[PDB]
Design a protein around this ligand. Sequence first.
Ligand SMILES: Nc1ncnc2c1ncn2[C@@H]1O[C@H](COP(=O)(O)OP(=O)(O)O)[C@@H](O)[C@H]1O
Ligand SMILES: Nc1ncnc2c1ncn2[C@@H]1O[C@H](COP(=O)(O)OP(=O)(O)O)[C@@H](O)[C@H]1O
Lengths: 453, 152, 371, 371
Amino acid sequence: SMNPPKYDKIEDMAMMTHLHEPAVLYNLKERYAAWMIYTYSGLFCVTVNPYKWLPVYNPEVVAAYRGKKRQEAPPHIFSISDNAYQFMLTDRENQSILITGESGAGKTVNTKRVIQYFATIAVTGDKKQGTLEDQIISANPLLEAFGNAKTVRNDNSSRFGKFIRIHFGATGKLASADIETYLLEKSRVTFQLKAERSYHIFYQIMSNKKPELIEMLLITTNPYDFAYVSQGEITVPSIDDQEELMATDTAVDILGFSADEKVAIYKLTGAVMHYGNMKFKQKQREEQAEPDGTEVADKAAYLTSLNSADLLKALCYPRVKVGNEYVTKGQTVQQVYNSVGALAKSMYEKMFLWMVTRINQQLDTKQPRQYFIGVLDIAGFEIFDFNTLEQLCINFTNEKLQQFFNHHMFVLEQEEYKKEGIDWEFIDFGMDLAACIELIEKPMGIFSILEEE
Amino acid sequence: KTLAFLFSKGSSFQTVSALFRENLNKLMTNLKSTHPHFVRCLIPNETKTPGAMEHELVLHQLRCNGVLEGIRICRKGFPSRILYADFKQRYKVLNASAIPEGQFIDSKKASEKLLGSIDIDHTQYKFGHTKVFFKAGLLGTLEEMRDEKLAQ
Amino acid sequence: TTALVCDNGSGLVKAGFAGDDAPRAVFPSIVGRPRHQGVMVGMGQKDSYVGDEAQSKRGILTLKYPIEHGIITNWDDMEKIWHHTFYNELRVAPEEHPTLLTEAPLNPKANREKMTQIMFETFNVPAMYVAIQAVLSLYASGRTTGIVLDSGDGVTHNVPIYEGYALPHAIMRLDLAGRDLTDYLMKILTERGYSFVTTAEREIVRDIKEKLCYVALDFENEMATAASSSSLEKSYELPDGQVITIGNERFRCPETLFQPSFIGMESAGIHETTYNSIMKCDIDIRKDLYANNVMSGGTTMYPGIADRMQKEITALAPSTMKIKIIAPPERKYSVWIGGSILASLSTFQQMWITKQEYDEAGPSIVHRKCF
Amino acid sequence: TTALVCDNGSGLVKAGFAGDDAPRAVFPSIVGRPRHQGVMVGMGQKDSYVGDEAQSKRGILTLKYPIEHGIITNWDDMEKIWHHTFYNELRVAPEEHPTLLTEAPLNPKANREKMTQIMFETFNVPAMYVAIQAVLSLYASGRTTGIVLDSGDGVTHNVPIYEGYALPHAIMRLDLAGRDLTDYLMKILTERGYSFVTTAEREIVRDIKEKLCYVALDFENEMATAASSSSLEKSYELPDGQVITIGNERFRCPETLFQPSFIGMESAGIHETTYNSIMKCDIDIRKDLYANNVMSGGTTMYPGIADRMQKEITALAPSTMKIKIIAPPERKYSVWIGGSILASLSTFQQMWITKQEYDEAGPSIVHRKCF
Ligand SMILES: Nc1ncnc2c1ncn2[C@@H]1O[C@H](COP(=O)(O)OP(=O)(O)O)[C@@H](O)[C@H]1O
Ligand SMILES: Nc1ncnc2c1ncn2[C@@H]1O[C@H](COP(=O)(O)OP(=O)(O)O)[C@@H](O)[C@H]1O
């Protein structure tokens, strides 16, 4: 039997007074039928895309007040920013605000609005060139294609690791920001199921529209050719990659960075998919894996400005030694196949990494930074009936994040014990669930022993 | 001349998932410096629509969104603070007792008397220095008492 | 922290962390000392010298060689070598890592006991292990069954390993390694009679063993070509000084492995030893080994060994069944590479010796605890 | 649901649902364990191995054989085997079916009591039965009367069955099965003196027993041909290694059945046992059995047995009356096939043991309840 109308109209899951999930859920559902937006647990606010017009934004609340610490004001994400500021303002070491799941529309929309409220902070600090949200938008369409992915249960969902940083030489109006480099999932290039598709860049480019590139790419417009590419589902019916190509152009031109490099750059990816064709062969009385002599390799040579024979000898039976120098020969079929896939993947990785340098520099400023506030997109866990290790690993990372959540709360709550005179009868949640991770982790890692063996 | 940025001891050709740990690990380390802040986010609906709730994935998302088992964790806390003045402004009823407002009675004293009629416990409640602390059930029973008594 | 492995397979000595592809650098285990009154008073006198430093300095130094027949001759010298290697190359402190030791199989306990005793006491080192060559050879070569031949600087081996287990009865162990062969070389070389005997002079041959050797395909037929041709004969310089030019004296050398008359012994040779040791081992397994045949290190470097070996096995095998051998490029490094793999797996955390045992029981611990 | 039958007639072990024509797969009931220090640390150590997995792995494993003389030697080993068979082949849970057990007749109660005890307790299984071989043999062969000879891996049988009833006094039971014969084979084989003794080496003979055996038509006359000819002699390879070529040593082997001198016993042999056991049984029936004569499994596989058997009966019978024998193709499977038939009929629903009885009374239940 359930927490009564007093409880029923409160702001807070955080101040629960009966614990079983349905309580929480229905009650927030009551908010939802009330359309009452902003929901609170932990010390913090929990969010739903309203799917409708409301001028939540309209400055009457937003500007006119900083607002209040948590209990004191109506729930709003605007709060969390607000008080994180005044907290840091005195505290003057950094804070980030962490935003979970929601992997499509509302996630990104609200991240936008988050930086919009950063603009409101700018207005609060001082007032008198892409707009700074619009500057992030400069990244968004290309980067969105760049690391989005398709889940059985999600259709544009992104399995890079991005992290967003914002940086202050200023406590004035606003000072400028980073978006940063974090766990990226190389294995997706390795494999797909026939229901499933590939890093969106590939899927996008590989559409038919741009007449010169396709042959300049040394490519057939057919995905079907590249088995290593082909592994997936052969289209998404109605995500229209002709226009999405045009958007990619729009961004890369908005780069203010050179055609020739950038074309060569995606061409690198073209080479990568060409590597899926590379396939080696094993001779009599001999274990080596050995060449198919292939126009593919010649395409590589052309694009690389290597010669193919250079590949053939120098890689396909390598040399490593230093202090004297010595040569490596006879790799297994598997050894070769894995090896080349690894190289390709690393190259894709590198390309992402490079994107940092100039993209940020376009963002980057001789306006100083002393101090930092940050954004993250995903503690990403999803379910499938069927599973593959990497996903589980990311889930591991998610729960790790929850370790971080838990032990910080553990400490803080102990401070609240202190607050009104009271003594701790509770032990680290961070440790407690960390034990659950510890089943995964000993100095032996589960992962460790797998890859090790 | 992509290649220089193309190009540039812990391991070689190995440690690969552990490398992926490493990549996280540094991030975690640096985050440890920070104060974190938190938002968890939901499609309650079948869709992104004015159209209404779809429950079950919202269930599981909330399972995925720590608040649920976080609150599991916290309920042990008796994770609860309720302010003297409102609370007693409801609760005095059973004591049926007049001793003057202000600190002739603290809220603590008024509790010790009403509790003397009602309860002696740590787990159901303990004193806080300005605000008052309870098992989830307890407020529930408190007002259960209040309606039952006032109706009679 | 991190984990570090010494190779003390003889010849140049190999050391490196787990997971590097190849050891950082490598040293002969020469030791050498002065021979003459020190007559530059300006010079600092150091009385012992090791490694490429000595390899440069050699001429007035004279060599001692601290491992005979794979058995390490003089402990304190080793300790000098070992200390040098850590500090000078490795910039490493004994606490820093577990350390892994590389052993001739089937050889006297003493090397175990003193090695461990010293290295736990003289160095103080988190975890210790000593491992038999063939195991590493398999791990690197990655076939769980096999037989290995690796005739290094030191004593020369046959071990069949089946997947996951030892057959210590099966095993054959021989002092036929290239050093003694080389010293036979001089007794050859005086035929042409350019002739020099001392340790450094003996090591000069090692270069020729790199450059000038190749394996006899057929001995009689080679002699017939020897009568016919001089292409068999090649021209080579002193490391400094003369050009020297060498006949059959090159190819005759490896045959000793097949016929250890020339420095005379009976053990019927590598190949006949191998087939013998097979015929010891049981009947069904044999095909696998006929398939899986593996060779490594110092002697194997020579071009052609595998071929005549196969010729020999085709002699001795019933021809009916498949035969092949493996001849990887990297064989001379193979051991330390395998050691790196060996280091990698967490199970040695179950398996290492720890200081605690060495406290609570002697060197005796090893001989139960390790193979 | 559905109903499942284990064959534990010895040799490879046979298991399958009611109504399939042939069991899904079949396993020797070898059990084997390591023999040598485990020296690939990378290897997972499993300490016991069974089935074709072992049949591959054999060489360092050594065998135990969990059934002597049809009597199952070591229960927990059986339990290992049994568990493996269910989960690995069958993907089956003990609840899933009634299960039917296949027994040497006239042998010690203990096998009954522990077998049932374990399988109701350790496995928990809806319904249990244990059935005597000959019954199945008739059902499959489909003649309600008969006499059966089936000399499997294990103890060798004579049962006359009349239609619908047992004659347990009539019955003869013999430890003469092919395994012991095979072990005699080695004491033959040392004449040619290619010679090896261990368990796996002994099983190698089994192949030869498949390939190389055939039944002596006449012993004297065969010896005369043995003096004349080498067509009697055939050439066969080691499973790997040598070609081997075998004389009278092939045909001499089965004669042991007729003359168990060669490993020496007295019971006057299969045929004389049979006619003896007949002359025990009563007078009128006999003609039917003279007509209906039935043979199966391991030994019977040999070409020609039925013929010399008939020769023997024509010796011992009054020639006046008809004689024939049945030699079906499928004999080695016959038992499990019959078991399938046995499983089919609803009457076992009347007849099965149920868990309830095992609750309410002990293993003792069986010996009343079953034959
Ligand atoms: N280039 C070369 N060609 C042939 N043999 C060589 C060459 N370099 C070194 N060796 C020989 O290989 C051996 C090197 O020692 P090693 O094989 O590591 O012995 P161990 O097996 O004891 O470790 C020595 O016998 C050395 O003379
Ligand atoms: N191809 C074959 N030729 C002759 N005998 C065989 C052949 N295969 C198996 N056997 C023998 O048949 C027997 C197989 O066991 P089985 O007949 O099922 O015994 P059981 O009657 O105890 O079930 C063993 O004695 C085995 O050696």
